[PDB]
PDB file of all heavy atoms in Angstrom:
ATOM      1  N   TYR A   1       3.751 -67.232  37.940  1.00 26.25           N
ATOM      2  CA  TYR A   1       4.253 -66.817  36.639  1.00 26.25           C
ATOM      3  C   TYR A   1       3.148 -66.039  35.941  1.00 26.25           C
ATOM      4  O   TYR A   1       2.077 -66.593  35.671  1.00 26.25           O
ATOM      5  CB  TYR A   1       4.664 -68.031  35.806  1.00 26.25           C
ATOM      6  N   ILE A   2       3.406 -64.767  35.649  1.00 25.52           N
ATOM      7  CA  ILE A   2       2.429 -63.891  35.009  1.00 25.52           C
ATOM      8  C   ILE A   2       2.795 -63.767  33.540  1.00 25.52           C
ATOM      9  O   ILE A   2       3.964 -63.557  33.198  1.00 25.52           O
ATOM     10  CB  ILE A   2       2.376 -62.508  35.686  1.00 25.52           C
ATOM     11  N   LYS A   3       1.791 -63.886  32.678  1.00 25.02           N
ATOM     12  CA  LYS A   3       1.930 -63.687  31.244  1.00 25.02           C
ATOM     13  C   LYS A   3       1.112 -62.475  30.833  1.00 25.02           C
ATOM     14  O   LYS A   3      -0.047 -62.342  31.239  1.00 25.02           O
ATOM     15  CB  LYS A   3       1.458 -64.925  30.476  1.00 25.02           C
ATOM     16  N   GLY A   4       1.714 -61.594  30.036  1.00 25.47           N
ATOM     17  CA  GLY A   4       0.971 -60.591  29.298  1.00 25.47           C
ATOM     18  C   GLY A   4       1.172 -59.156  29.725  1.00 25.47           C
ATOM     19  O   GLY A   4       0.496 -58.281  29.177  1.00 25.47           O
ATOM     20  N   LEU A   5       2.062 -58.866  30.668  1.00 23.85           N
ATOM     21  CA  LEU A   5       2.287 -57.474  31.025  1.00 23.85           C
ATOM     22  C   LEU A   5       2.960 -56.743  29.867  1.00 23.85           C
ATOM     23  O   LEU A   5       3.570 -57.353  28.986  1.00 23.85           O
ATOM     24  CB  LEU A   5       3.150 -57.357  32.283  1.00 23.85           C
ATOM     25  N   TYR A   6       2.833 -55.418  29.871  1.00 25.48           N
ATOM     26  CA  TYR A   6       3.414 -54.564  28.841  1.00 25.48           C
ATOM     27  C   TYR A   6       4.154 -53.410  29.493  1.00 25.48           C
ATOM     28  O   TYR A   6       3.602 -52.718  30.354  1.00 25.48           O
ATOM     29  CB  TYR A   6       2.340 -54.029  27.896  1.00 25.48           C
ATOM     30  N   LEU A   7       5.400 -53.213  29.087  1.00 23.49           N
ATOM     31  CA  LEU A   7       6.207 -52.083  29.511  1.00 23.49           C
ATOM     32  C   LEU A   7       5.992 -50.918  28.550  1.00 23.49           C
ATOM     33  O   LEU A   7       5.441 -51.083  27.460  1.00 23.49           O
ATOM     34  CB  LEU A   7       7.681 -52.493  29.559  1.00 23.49           C
ATOM     35  N   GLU A   8       6.406 -49.723  28.975  1.00 22.79           N
ATOM     36  CA  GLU A   8       6.412 -48.545  28.108  1.00 22.79           C
ATOM     37  C   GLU A   8       7.730 -47.799  28.246  1.00 22.79           C
ATOM     38  O   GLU A   8       7.969 -47.140  29.262  1.00 22.79           O
ATOM     39  CB  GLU A   8       5.248 -47.614  28.425  1.00 22.79           C
ATOM     40  N   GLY A   9       8.573 -47.898  27.224  1.00 22.27           N
ATOM     41  CA  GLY A   9       9.669 -46.971  27.040  1.00 22.27           C
ATOM     42  C   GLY A   9      11.068 -47.463  27.337  1.00 22.27           C
ATOM     43  O   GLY A   9      11.961 -46.626  27.490  1.00 22.27           O
ATOM     44  N   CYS A  10      11.298 -48.768  27.418  1.00 20.69           N
ATOM     45  CA  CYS A  10      12.661 -49.283  27.563  1.00 20.69           C
ATOM     46  C   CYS A  10      12.650 -50.793  27.330  1.00 20.69           C
ATOM     47  O   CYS A  10      11.649 -51.364  26.881  1.00 20.69           O
ATOM     48  CB  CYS A  10      13.249 -48.929  28.930  1.00 20.69           C
ATOM     49  N   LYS A  11      13.787 -51.431  27.611  1.00 22.33           N
ATOM     50  CA  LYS A  11      13.930 -52.878  27.588  1.00 22.33           C
ATOM     51  C   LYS A  11      13.602 -53.447  28.968  1.00 22.33           C
ATOM     52  O   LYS A  11      13.340 -52.725  29.929  1.00 22.33           O
ATOM     53  CB  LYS A  11      15.350 -53.270  27.159  1.00 22.33           C
ATOM     54  N   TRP A  12      13.585 -54.770  29.042  1.00 19.49           N
ATOM     55  CA  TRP A  12      13.454 -55.555  30.259  1.00 19.49           C
ATOM     56  C   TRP A  12      14.599 -55.333  31.230  1.00 19.49           C
ATOM     57  O   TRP A  12      14.413 -54.784  32.321  1.00 19.49           O
ATOM     58  CB  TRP A  12      13.405 -57.024  29.866  1.00 19.49           C
ATOM     59  N   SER A  13      15.783 -55.776  30.830  1.00 19.86           N
ATOM     60  CA  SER A  13      17.019 -55.544  31.552  1.00 19.86           C
ATOM     61  C   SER A  13      17.999 -54.933  30.572  1.00 19.86           C
ATOM     62  O   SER A  13      17.897 -55.146  29.361  1.00 19.86           O
ATOM     63  CB  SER A  13      17.593 -56.833  32.145  1.00 19.86           C
ATOM     64  N   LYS A  14      18.957 -54.182  31.101  1.00 20.41           N
ATOM     65  CA  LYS A  14      19.749 -53.280  30.279  1.00 20.41           C
ATOM     66  C   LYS A  14      18.811 -52.293  29.585  1.00 20.41           C
ATOM     67  O   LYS A  14      18.818 -52.128  28.364  1.00 20.41           O
ATOM     68  CB  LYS A  14      20.615 -54.053  29.274  1.00 20.41           C
ATOM     69  N   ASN A  15      17.971 -51.653  30.397  1.00 17.74           N
ATOM     70  CA  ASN A  15      16.952 -50.741  29.893  1.00 17.74           C
ATOM     71  C   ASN A  15      17.592 -49.585  29.142  1.00 17.74           C
ATOM     72  O   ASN A  15      18.520 -48.940  29.642  1.00 17.74           O
ATOM     73  CB  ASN A  15      16.118 -50.212  31.059  1.00 17.74           C
ATOM     74  N   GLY A  16      17.080 -49.313  27.940  1.00 19.27           N
ATOM     75  CA  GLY A  16      17.635 -48.294  27.075  1.00 19.27           C
ATOM     76  C   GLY A  16      16.535 -47.497  26.406  1.00 19.27           C
ATOM     77  O   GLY A  16      15.349 -47.757  26.599  1.00 19.27           O
ATOM     78  N   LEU A  17      16.956 -46.514  25.619  1.00 20.62           N
ATOM     79  CA  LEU A  17      16.008 -45.647  24.938  1.00 20.62           C
ATOM     80  C   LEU A  17      15.244 -46.429  23.875  1.00 20.62           C
ATOM     81  O   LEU A  17      15.832 -47.195  23.108  1.00 20.62           O
ATOM     82  CB  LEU A  17      16.745 -44.467  24.304  1.00 20.62           C
ATOM     83  N   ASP A  18      13.931 -46.234  23.836  1.00 20.83           N
ATOM     84  CA  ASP A  18      13.100 -46.894  22.841  1.00 20.83           C
ATOM     85  C   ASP A  18      13.336 -46.296  21.456  1.00 20.83           C
ATOM     86  O   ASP A  18      13.660 -45.115  21.311  1.00 20.83           O
ATOM     87  CB  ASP A  18      11.624 -46.768  23.228  1.00 20.83           C
ATOM     88  N   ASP A  19      13.174 -47.128  20.432  1.00 21.99           N
ATOM     89  CA  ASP A  19      13.259 -46.658  19.058  1.00 21.99           C
ATOM     90  C   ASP A  19      12.029 -45.816  18.721  1.00 21.99           C
ATOM     91  O   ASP A  19      11.148 -45.591  19.554  1.00 21.99           O
ATOM     92  CB  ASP A  19      13.402 -47.842  18.104  1.00 21.99           C
ATOM     93  N   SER A  20      11.972 -45.337  17.476  1.00 19.01           N
ATOM     94  CA  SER A  20      10.911 -44.410  17.092  1.00 19.01           C
ATOM     95  C   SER A  20       9.538 -45.084  17.094  1.00 19.01           C
ATOM     96  O   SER A  20       8.545 -44.474  17.509  1.00 19.01           O
ATOM     97  CB  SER A  20      11.221 -43.808  15.724  1.00 19.01           C
ATOM     98  N   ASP A  21       9.458 -46.328  16.633  1.00 19.14           N
ATOM     99  CA  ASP A  21       8.219 -47.092  16.665  1.00 19.14           C
ATOM    100  C   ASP A  21       8.180 -47.942  17.935  1.00 19.14           C
ATOM    101  O   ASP A  21       9.055 -47.846  18.798  1.00 19.14           O
ATOM    102  CB  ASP A  21       8.102 -47.947  15.406  1.00 19.14           C
ATOM    103  N   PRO A  22       7.154 -48.787  18.058  1.00 18.80           N
ATOM    104  CA  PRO A  22       7.034 -49.767  19.138  1.00 18.80           C
ATOM    105  C   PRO A  22       7.067 -49.086  20.510  1.00 18.80           C
ATOM    106  O   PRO A  22       7.997 -49.242  21.301  1.00 18.80           O
ATOM    107  CB  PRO A  22       8.129 -50.834  19.027  1.00 18.80           C
ATOM    108  N   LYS A  23       6.016 -48.301  20.762  1.00 21.16           N
ATOM    109  CA  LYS A  23       5.918 -47.594  22.036  1.00 21.16           C
ATOM    110  C   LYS A  23       5.592 -48.541  23.184  1.00 21.16           C
ATOM    111  O   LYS A  23       6.050 -48.330  24.311  1.00 21.16           O
ATOM    112  CB  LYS A  23       4.862 -46.495  21.952  1.00 21.16           C
ATOM    113  N   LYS A  24       4.787 -49.571  22.928  1.00 23.13           N
ATOM    114  CA  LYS A  24       4.371 -50.531  23.944  1.00 23.13           C
ATOM    115  C   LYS A  24       5.052 -51.865  23.680  1.00 23.13           C
ATOM    116  O   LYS A  24       4.884 -52.450  22.605  1.00 23.13           O
ATOM    117  CB  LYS A  24       2.852 -50.689  23.951  1.00 23.13           C
ATOM    118  N   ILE A  25       5.790 -52.354  24.676  1.00 19.88           N
ATOM    119  CA  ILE A  25       6.681 -53.497  24.546  1.00 19.88           C
ATOM    120  C   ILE A  25       6.240 -54.558  25.543  1.00 19.88           C
ATOM    121  O   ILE A  25       5.684 -54.250  26.602  1.00 19.88           O
ATOM    122  CB  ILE A  25       8.163 -53.100  24.779  1.00 19.88           C
ATOM    123  N   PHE A  26       6.491 -55.816  25.194  1.00 16.79           N
ATOM    124  CA  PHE A  26       6.128 -56.939  26.046  1.00 16.79           C
ATOM    125  C   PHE A  26       6.884 -56.867  27.375  1.00 16.79           C
ATOM    126  O   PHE A  26       7.871 -56.143  27.523  1.00 16.79           O
ATOM    127  CB  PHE A  26       6.415 -58.249  25.303  1.00 16.79           C
ATOM    128  N   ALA A  27       6.368 -57.592  28.369  1.00 17.19           N
ATOM    129  CA  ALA A  27       6.986 -57.724  29.684  1.00 17.19           C
ATOM    130  C   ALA A  27       7.264 -59.199  29.946  1.00 17.19           C
ATOM    131  O   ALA A  27       6.396 -60.046  29.731  1.00 17.19           O
ATOM    132  CB  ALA A  27       6.100 -57.176  30.777  1.00 17.19           C
ATOM    133  N   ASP A  28       8.454 -59.504  30.447  1.00 21.62           N
ATOM    134  CA  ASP A  28       8.922 -60.879  30.508  1.00 21.62           C
ATOM    135  C   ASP A  28       8.354 -61.481  31.781  1.00 21.62           C
ATOM    136  O   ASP A  28       7.566 -60.847  32.484  1.00 21.62           O
ATOM    137  CB  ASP A  28      10.450 -60.939  30.448  1.00 21.62           C
ATOM    138  N   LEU A  29       8.745 -62.694  32.097  1.00 21.67           N
ATOM    139  CA  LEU A  29       8.070 -63.380  33.178  1.00 21.67           C
ATOM    140  C   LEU A  29       8.486 -62.815  34.529  1.00 21.67           C
ATOM    141  O   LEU A  29       9.566 -63.153  35.019  1.00 21.67           O
ATOM    142  CB  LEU A  29       8.372 -64.872  33.106  1.00 21.67           C
ATOM    143  N   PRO A  30       7.672 -61.968  35.179  1.00 21.25           N
ATOM    144  CA  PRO A  30       8.142 -61.372  36.435  1.00 21.25           C
ATOM    145  C   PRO A  30       7.758 -62.246  37.627  1.00 21.25           C
ATOM    146  O   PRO A  30       6.733 -62.052  38.268  1.00 21.25           O
ATOM    147  CB  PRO A  30       7.430 -60.017  36.445  1.00 21.25           C
ATOM    148  N   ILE A  31       8.554 -63.279  37.919  1.00 19.69           N
ATOM    149  CA  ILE A  31       8.135 -64.212  38.960  1.00 19.69           C
ATOM    150  C   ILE A  31       8.219 -63.502  40.302  1.00 19.69           C
ATOM    151  O   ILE A  31       9.095 -62.654  40.530  1.00 19.69           O
ATOM    152  CB  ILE A  31       8.954 -65.518  38.936  1.00 19.69           C
ATOM    153  N   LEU A  32       7.271 -63.810  41.175  1.00 17.12           N
ATOM    154  CA  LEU A  32       7.089 -63.089  42.421  1.00 17.12           C
ATOM    155  C   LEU A  32       7.992 -63.686  43.496  1.00 17.12           C
ATOM    156  O   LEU A  32       8.770 -64.607  43.248  1.00 17.12           O
ATOM    157  CB  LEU A  32       5.614 -63.122  42.818  1.00 17.12           C
ATOM    158  N   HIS A  33       7.894 -63.148  44.708  1.00 18.08           N
ATOM    159  CA  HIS A  33       8.691 -63.614  45.829  1.00 18.08           C
ATOM    160  C   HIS A  33       8.133 -62.956  47.078  1.00 18.08           C
ATOM    161  O   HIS A  33       7.703 -61.803  47.028  1.00 18.08           O
ATOM    162  CB  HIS A  33      10.173 -63.259  45.628  1.00 18.08           C
ATOM    163  N   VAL A  34       8.098 -63.698  48.177  1.00 14.87           N
ATOM    164  CA  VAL A  34       7.603 -63.177  49.444  1.00 14.87           C
ATOM    165  C   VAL A  34       8.510 -63.687  50.550  1.00 14.87           C
ATOM    166  O   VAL A  34       9.033 -64.802  50.484  1.00 14.87           O
ATOM    167  CB  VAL A  34       6.130 -63.569  49.698  1.00 14.87           C
ATOM    168  N   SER A  35       8.691 -62.865  51.578  1.00 13.98           N
ATOM    169  CA  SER A  35       9.669 -63.184  52.609  1.00 13.98           C
ATOM    170  C   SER A  35       9.263 -62.504  53.898  1.00 13.98           C
ATOM    171  O   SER A  35       8.592 -61.480  53.883  1.00 13.98           O
ATOM    172  CB  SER A  35      11.068 -62.728  52.200  1.00 13.98           C
ATOM    173  N   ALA A  36       9.695 -63.063  55.017  1.00 13.88           N
ATOM    174  CA  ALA A  36       9.434 -62.399  56.282  1.00 13.88           C
ATOM    175  C   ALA A  36      10.271 -61.130  56.381  1.00 13.88           C
ATOM    176  O   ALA A  36      11.349 -61.024  55.795  1.00 13.88           O
ATOM    177  CB  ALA A  36       9.731 -63.334  57.446  1.00 13.88           C
ATOM    178  N   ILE A  37       9.753 -60.151  57.119  1.00 13.75           N
ATOM    179  CA  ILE A  37      10.368 -58.829  57.144  1.00 13.75           C
ATOM    180  C   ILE A  37      11.710 -58.891  57.862  1.00 13.75           C
ATOM    181  O   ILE A  37      11.846 -59.527  58.916  1.00 13.75           O
ATOM    182  CB  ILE A  37       9.415 -57.810  57.795  1.00 13.75           C
ATOM    183  N   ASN A  38      12.715 -58.225  57.285  1.00 13.13           N
ATOM    184  CA  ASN A  38      14.065 -58.155  57.857  1.00 13.13           C
ATOM    185  C   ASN A  38      14.658 -59.544  58.074  1.00 13.13           C
ATOM    186  O   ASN A  38      15.377 -59.782  59.045  1.00 13.13           O
ATOM    187  CB  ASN A  38      14.072 -57.369  59.169  1.00 13.13           C
ATOM    188  N   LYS A  39      14.350 -60.468  57.169  1.00 13.67           N
ATOM    189  CA  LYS A  39      14.797 -61.855  57.287  1.00 13.67           C
ATOM    190  C   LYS A  39      15.130 -62.427  55.914  1.00 13.67           C
ATOM    191  O   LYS A  39      15.167 -61.703  54.920  1.00 13.67           O
ATOM    192  CB  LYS A  39      13.728 -62.716  57.965  1.00 13.67           C
TER     193      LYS A  39
END
């Protein structure tokens, strides 16, 4: 679980056009995942 990433220019999901202010936006919990190839 990573805390503190920052996006630039949309939402997390349902990404849309940014408003006039708030150029740098928080990033939500991007939990990772690893898997064997083609499996």
